[PDB]
Design a protein around this ligand. Structure first.
Ligand SMILES: *[C@@H]1O[C@H](CO)[C@@H](O[C@@H]2O[C@H](CO)[C@@H](O)[C@H](O)[C@H]2NC(C)=O)[C@H](O)[C@H]1NC(C)=O
Ligand SMILES: *[C@@H]1O[C@H](CO)[C@@H](O[C@@H]2O[C@H](CO)[C@@H](O)[C@H](O)[C@H]2NC(C)=O)[C@H](O)[C@H]1NC(C)=O
Ligand SMILES: *[C@@H]1O[C@H](CO)[C@@H](O)[C@H](O)[C@H]1NC(C)=O
Ligand SMILES: *[C@@H]1O[C@H](CO)[C@@H](O)[C@H](O)[C@H]1NC(C)=O
Ligand SMILES: *[C@@H]1O[C@H](CO)[C@@H](O)[C@H](O)[C@H]1NC(C)=O
Ligand SMILES: *[C@@H]1O[C@H](CO)[C@@H](O)[C@H](O)[C@H]1NC(C)=O
Ligand SMILES: *[C@@H]1O[C@H](CO)[C@@H](O)[C@H](O)[C@H]1NC(C)=O
Ligand SMILES: *[C@@H]1O[C@H](CO)[C@@H](O)[C@H](O)[C@H]1NC(C)=O
Ligand SMILES: *[C@@H]1O[C@H](CO)[C@@H](O)[C@H](O)[C@H]1NC(C)=O
Ligand SMILES: *[C@@H]1O[C@H](CO)[C@@H](O)[C@H](O)[C@H]1NC(C)=O
Ligand SMILES: *[C@@H]1O[C@H](CO)[C@@H](O)[C@H](O)[C@H]1NC(C)=O
Ligand SMILES: *[C@@H]1O[C@H](CO)[C@@H](O)[C@H](O)[C@H]1NC(C)=O
Lengths: 202, 418, 86, 50
């Protein structure tokens, strides 16, 4: 069932054609569904009436078919436009659009050819094995409020570290990975810690 | 009158003048989208012939037109559940909010489910829902309003307690203020702005949400987009039904009257006229429903995209998730549709500064690492572009590239070395 | 049910993922006999939210998912005159 | 006036001259019984898809 989306298109069109063909077997009020039988039996003044009935019915049947194909074509066009967009944004680049190029954080995609369609293999980064940490919006040090430049301040229960938000990697909190803005009396939930200065040893 | 296209507004443009917001507001806007359409179903044979065997036998002479029509409407009905699923069923787990709603001053009581009401709808959802024989029947949606509300509450709970992480992998809890701080970074505003103004921001947010409920309540036309869909389908059905009263050239619009008066050799002629007219009327209805269904599908696809990009993440697409700099969005269930409350950061209270592309110091050209160089008339500072915050220009917030004889408009200043 | 009268399916209290949709929150499945149930919207999951607690992934996986899209349709062509009149 | 359906006592206040009523579909949904002058509501016999 994996390729049901492509098979459904094939089935709908095959069904539409089969229906169109079957309509040729209908009388539509005529003495016969077969045009040759009408012509072999009746003279023009009477054949015309029976033929007119078949023309009306068959013309109507064909109009129905075409209308459905135009509506269906519009759906396929929309799908093709979506596929083209994904080709550009998922394959020829890296997308930041959520759920656009697979579920997770999009890394890259690889296109594959398919019957009347395209298959995209979306390679995503999915976070795993998370654990609880105590966090803070800022660190208070020497009366100054220090904020993380890239990551988040976390504690393992005894020590505070700064780490990238999407992957635990506990670095020492230093002046090179934080910045100062304002004093410690403004930030709600600010905690006391040390901010290491690499220059202090020298 | 000749219509206005808006007020004229000249920009105070010059080669060295920049405007920078010294304040901002939190704006919440409402976007209303159709997701689904009433799942109508028409019994072709009954509509045309009622319970007449004589008509039914004549109807068979037209082949499988009724099969195509019944099939087309069935296809639409199925699509309508798909549309709902694509928009709302985007979360694998049903997330719940904590017993204690401490989000750092941020009040979500108007978007979260109200536990005192059996319907378990939010105050806003409750408002949204309050605002909006002949073989013709209506099929129920697979997902009831209650189930749609549950999906919405799950999305809200996730958005509030775990930010966007639940939309990528597992739900990773995070303090709401910290989540908002990340969303500020996402729009080019430093995180300290969120924390320093946390009280103000929470108040602006809470006020904006209150305004949403008042705006919807006092604006009957607010949900016109959903009402229009209901009106179009009701109108289509009413027209289809009225066509049964037409003669189409027959002695009577009533099939039973024809059958009670005429013998088959003559009744057939009068019946054939009604079949042609009624079959044509039904084909017209179905064609319009297929075209209309396509429009609803497109809207549902847009709604699904917004659910993913506005709610399950932070968008960088302009005007995609409200007007302003998108911070976050909250979905709300609505009659045959979805309502998005878009929370945006809007710059406010800008003022004029003199700017420069670079600072010349010790023969070197210094460029700002993140912000822009601005002067208050006597002193040069470097500040973040989206929020005035004048820092001393130092070697830690600038970088050097080339000498002072290349950059056009470079100005002389001091660059402090810590 | 709100969808009509369902006969032959055994109604149960246990909620499962939807298999064959009936309508109005009701689905049916083969479990043997056919049963009817109110569909589950997914497992409940409370988040351990607090004002100072954060969860951070210590690992990750590389997932590959498949998205299948229609691009084209069979290019049918019908000769109107021949179809109608041969 | 012929048809098929379920006849029930009507609560529709017909005027003294009105013989039958119609719904929004312009089809008969009530009649005046020609012998008793009782007003009867007409509903279709139960039907639906299977
Ligand atoms: C969140 O906001 C709601 C209002 O939208 C607060 O509920 C109101 O509380 C006051 C009392 O302070 C009552 O007089 C109002 O009638 C309540 N209004 C409604 C609609 O309930 C709610 O208390 C706020 N929650 C927090 C934690 O501040
Ligand atoms: C930024 O704008 C906000 C309003 O959007 C200011 O906050 C208001 O300040 C006035 C006093 O001048 C109070 O009466 C209002 O009640 C405040 N509104 C809110 C929501 O708190 C804020 O002071 C401005 N900040 C700066 C630096 O101008
Ligand atoms: C965090 O602690 C809660 C208990 O308060 C627990 O249920 C949850 O699973 C923990 N989260 C992680 C990632 O261990
Ligand atoms: C926190 O990390 C430090 C450095 O690795 C370690 O010495 C300390 O024991 C850890 N604390 C806890 C509670 O694990
Ligand atoms: C969290 O709430 C507790 C009260 O239960 C308070 O004492 C503490 O300071 C708060 N922490 C933060 C970061 O808001
Ligand atoms: C942090 O330390 C200062 C002293 O330098 C103290 O006054 C303040 O209360 C402490 N704050 C916290 C949260 O411990
Ligand atoms: C900048 O100066 C111009 C006058 O040249 C004035 O019209 C404009 O409003 C000023 N902009 C701001 C933000 O004050
Ligand atoms: C520019 O800012 C400095 C530092 O706050 C201040 O001393 C100076 O007076 C300001 N100049 C003007 C024109 O406001
Ligand atoms: C702006 O234009 C003036 C001429 O009117 C020129 O003297 C000045 O250097 C220019 N400044 C910049 C940044 O181009
Ligand atoms: C900047 O200062 C240098 C001297 O160090 C001078 O030659 C140059 O013309 C000055 N440029 C400007 C724009 O003042
Ligand atoms: C479902 O639970 C109810 C009690 O709430 C009980 O009366 C009913 O018989 C149960 N039905 C089945 C077959 O599980
Ligand atoms: C005959 O019909 C009239 C109504 O026009 C009614 O009043 C009368 O009672 C009927 N008589 C009998 C014997 O049914």
């Amino acid at each position: 069932s994996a390729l049901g989306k492509l098979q459904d298109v094939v089935n709908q069109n095959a069904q539409a054609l089969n229906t169109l063909v079957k309509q040729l077997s209908s009388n539509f009020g005529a003495i016969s569904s077969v045009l040759n039988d009408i012509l072999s039996r009746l003279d023009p003044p009477e054949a015309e009436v029976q033929i007119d009935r078949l023309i009306t019915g068959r013309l109507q049947s064909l109009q129905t078919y075409v209308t459905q194909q135009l509506i269906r074509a519009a759906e396929i066009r929309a799908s093709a436009n979506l596929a083209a967009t994904k080709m550009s944004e998922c394959v020829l680049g890296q997308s930041k659009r959520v759920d656009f190029c697979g579920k997770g954080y999009h890394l890259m995609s690889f296109p594959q050819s398919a019957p009347h369609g395209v298959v995209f293999l979306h390679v995503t980064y999915v976070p795993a094995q998370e654990k609880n940490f105590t966090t803070a919006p800022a660190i208070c040090h020497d009366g100054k409020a220090h904020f993380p430049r890239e990551g988040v301040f976390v504690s393992n229960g005894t020590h505070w570290f700064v780490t990238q938000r999407n992957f635990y990697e506990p670095q020492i909190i230093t002046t090179d990975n934080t910045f100062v803005s304002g004093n410690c009396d403004v930030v709600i939930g600010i905690v006391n810690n040390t901010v290491y200065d690499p220059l202090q040893p020298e | 009158y000749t219509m206005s296209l808006g007020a004229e507004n000249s920009v105070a443009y010059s080669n060295n003048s920049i405007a920078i917001p010294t304040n901002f507001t939190i704006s919440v806007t409402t976007e209303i989208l159709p997701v689904s359409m009433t799942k109508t179903s028409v019994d072709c044979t009954m509509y045309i012939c009622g319970d007449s065997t004589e008509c039914s036998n004549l109807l068979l002479q037209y082949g499988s037109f009724c099969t195509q029509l019944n099939r087309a409407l069935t296809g639409i009905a199925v699509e309508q559940d798909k549309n709902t699923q694509e928009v709302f069923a985007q979360v694998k787990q049903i997330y719940k909010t904590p017993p204690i709603k401490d989000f750092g001053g941020f009040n979500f009581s108007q978007i979260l489910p109200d536990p005192s009401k059996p319907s378990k709808r939010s105050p806003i959802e409750d408002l949204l829902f309050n605002k909006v024989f002949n073989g013709l029947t209506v099929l129920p949606p697979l997902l009831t309003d209650e189930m749609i509300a549950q999906y919405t509450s799950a999305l809200l709970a996730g958005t509030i307690t775990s930010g966007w992480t639940f939309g990528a992998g597992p739900a990773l809890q995070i303090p709401f203020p910290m989540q908002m701080a990340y969303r500020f970074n996402g729009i080019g505003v430093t995180q300290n702005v969120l924390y320093e103004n946390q009280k103000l921001i929470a108040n602006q947010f809470n006020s904006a949400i209150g305004k949403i409920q008042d705006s919807l309540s006092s604006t009957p036309s607010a949900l016109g987009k959903l009402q229009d869909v209901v009106n179009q389908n009701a109108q289509a059905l009413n027209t289809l039904v009225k066509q049964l009263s037409s003669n189409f050239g027959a002695i009577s619009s009533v099939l039973n009257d024809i059958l009670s008066r005429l013998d088959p050799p003559e009744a057939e002629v009068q019946i054939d006229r009604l079949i042609t007219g009624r079959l044509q009327s039904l084909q017209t209805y179905v064609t319009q429903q297929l075209i209309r269904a396509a429009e609803i599908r497109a809207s549902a696809n847009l709604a699904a995209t917004k659910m993913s990009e506005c709610v399950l993440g932070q968008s960088k697409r302009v005007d995609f998730c409200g007007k302003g700099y998108h911070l976050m969005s909250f979905p709300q269930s609505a009659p045959h549709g979805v309502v998005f409350l878009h929370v945006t950061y809007v710059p406010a209270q800008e003022k004029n500064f003199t700017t420069a592309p670079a600072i010349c110091h010790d023969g070197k050209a210094h460029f700002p690492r993140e912000g822009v160089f601005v002067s208050n008339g006597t002193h040069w500072f470097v500040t973040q572009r989206n929020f005035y915050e004048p820092q001393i220009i130092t070697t830690d917030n600038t970088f050097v590239s080339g000498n002072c004889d290349v950059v056009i408009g470079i100005v002389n200043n001091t660059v402090y070395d810590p | 049910t709100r969808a009509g009268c369902l006969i032959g399916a055994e109604h149960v209290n246990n909620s499962y993922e939807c298999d064959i949709p009936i309508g109005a929150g009701i689905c049916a499945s083969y479990q043997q006999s056919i049963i009817a149930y109110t569909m589950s919207l997914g497992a409940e999951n409370s988040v351990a939210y607090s004002n100072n607690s954060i969860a951070i992934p210590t690992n990750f996986t590389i997932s590959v998912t498949t998205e299948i899209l229609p691009v084209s349709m069979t290019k049918t062509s019908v000769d109107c005159t021949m179809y109608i009149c041969g | 006036l012929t048809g098929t359906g379920v006849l029930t006592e009507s609560n529709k206040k017909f005027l003294p001259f009105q013989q039958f009523g119609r719904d929004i579909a312009d089809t008969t949904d009530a009649v005046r019984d020609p012998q008793t002058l009782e007003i009867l509501d007409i509903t279709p016999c139960s039907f639906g898809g299977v």
